Amino acid sequence: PQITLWKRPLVTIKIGGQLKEALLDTGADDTVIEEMSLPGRWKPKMIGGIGGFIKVRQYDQIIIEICGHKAIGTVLVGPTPVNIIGRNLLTQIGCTLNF
Amino acid sequence: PQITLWKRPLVTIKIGGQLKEALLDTGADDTVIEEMSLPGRWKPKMIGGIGGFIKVRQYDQIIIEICGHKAIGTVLVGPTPVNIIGRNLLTQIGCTLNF
Amino acid sequence: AGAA
């Protein structure tokens, strides 16, 4: 699709069998999703703030579908108020900015 | 242009007759630019906390050029660590997300 | 990222 930016680019994603709303965020390096169950092993990570602010779980190789487009990569799972699809995943779905 | 997301989407912008590098940030509603001289009237806003941190001048009706695309809108001008073009100006240059 |  082509998402215009008059509104926030919130889209439906599918992750862990669950449908969620997520922000397509070109300013974000990585992808953080709200607290949920995923089947992997994970690694504890700290993100945000000045050297880490919130504990998140880093799940590698996660299949996620973003508007019908499948991608796999690292998803951080934590108390984020906003599900954020960062560039790590935007590149996997072949997402570009265009004007 | 068509900009991939492998790297930070940093482009050259023209503002105040100067060239600055700035992040095309679909996650940003608004636009923050490094401290610089702009003509005329502006109002004090504070930004950087939940509430606010960094003293920025709100200048309305600022012309910015991005890769040959002129936009006019509200720009927050102060010591942000990164120049950030948010949706308020991204929409003005016809910038969309595409996959 | 949020940034605004």
Of B1, B28, B95, nearest to A27 by CB-CB distance is B28
- Å from B11 to nearest chain A CA? 11
Structure tokens at A79: 């108390």
Amino acid identity at B98: N
| Phi, psi dihedrals of residue A55, rounded to the nearest 5° | -80, 135
Structure tokens at C3: 């940034």
Q: Tell me which chain C residues have a C-beta less than 8 angstroms from the C-beta of B84.
A: 3-4
Distance CA(A5)–CA(B92), nearest Å, equals 9
Q: Where do the domains of chain A lie?
A: 1-99
With an 8 Å Cβ cutoff, is A25 touching chain C?
A: yes
Task: Provide CB contacts within 8 A for A16, sequence distance 6+.
Answer: A36, A37, A38, A39, A62
Q: What is the DSSP string of A48-94?
A: STTT--EEEEEEEEEEEEETTEEEEEEEEES--SS-EE-HHHHTTTT
Nearest CA in chain B to C1: B27
Structure tokens at A87: 């560039």
Q: Which fold has domain A1-99?
A: Cathepsin D, subunit A; domain 1 (2.40.70)
